[model samples]
Target: HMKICITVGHSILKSGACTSADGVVNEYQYNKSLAPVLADTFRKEGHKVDVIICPEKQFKTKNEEKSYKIPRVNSGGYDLLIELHLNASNGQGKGSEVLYYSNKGLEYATRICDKLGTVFKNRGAKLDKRLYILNSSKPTAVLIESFFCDNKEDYDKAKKLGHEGIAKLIVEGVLNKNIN
Candidate 1:
């Protein structure tokens, strides 16, 4: 059986630093909602799924911490690591992107991101090497920024899509590609 790890960024215990415009919850919840669902789906299809929670109170910033957090998960015999996140910029950017560590994983990440963009009718995947989560992990890993939380239009679209939609998107991506 293929071993895969699903990681949710930030804290699900409480609302962490990042939040949607409505101030209801953080991006971590958005990412967490989908990761396990995807993992469960994969498990039912006969794969081993590992859910990695970032150790509490380890670091200050999400970016710096996630980079380190992902590697620890990857070292634990996972074939692939999917790091979930929501994007934010200087209040101007929007859309989704998938970050990959190696060219082997890049093709799969591209396919998933393309399908997600098509589902949401938004701009698709772009190659990003700057993210720490992707760079730090040894196993083939991908960091998915589902959408921009800070932007009203993007947040509204994401809210409408909901966790179920996100889970379905990820499952389709995983199953269609036969990642395991």
Candidate 2:
């Protein structure tokens, strides 16, 4: 098992919601709630895991966040890093999307989408060279847009999959093993 780090996406946002329902669910909160569980899951499998959270005291501007986040992750010497988020598209998008910077990251996303397909429509993995977290991270990294939080169908999958299910799918995708 590889040493991994999970970063909760948008733990701080200065403007519009990244994705939500009636402005209730920010992608960060959803991601934040699951990081610990994912870490535990990885730890149980005998792998090193770290969860990095961007606390309120750290930064005051959007650009501050950009420059600060990677510095910490860069120091970790992790084998892999995953930035978790939920997507939003006028309440129409219905699927999971993974953004990767390299072939190995693409491999991770493919496996994650395959398992998530059982609950949400699979949007498949796509190469992304521009995402800050993926580009700045030293280890293999991917930005996972889990599902459309605003879509009824996708939200249903969120409820059904639950936090544990999402964490399980993520670990299985990375480690290529059953969480159960």
Leading candidate by TM-score: 2
Task: Give the per-residue lDDT digits (tens) of candidate 1, residues 1-180.
Answer: 778888877652233443222222357766666777778777877889888766554546555555657556857887888878788776577777777767877776777787678545445555677766666777888877777766777777766777656766666675675432
Native-to-model Cα distance after best TM-score fit, residue 39 in candidate 2, in Å: 1.2
Model-by-model lDDT, in order?
0.68, 0.79
Candidate 1's C-alpha runs over 4 A off are 11-25, 57-71, 90-92, 177-180
lDDT of 2 by residue, 40-137 (tens): 98898999988887765445556665576799889989999988888887877778888999998989889988877767788999998988888888
Lowest summed lDDT window (length 10), candidate 1: 13-22
TM-score of each: 0.76, 0.90
Measured over all alpha carbons after superposition, the RMSD of each candidate to the real structure, in angstroms, is 4.0, 2.5
User: What TM-score, to 2 decimals, does candidate 1 have?
Assistant: 0.76
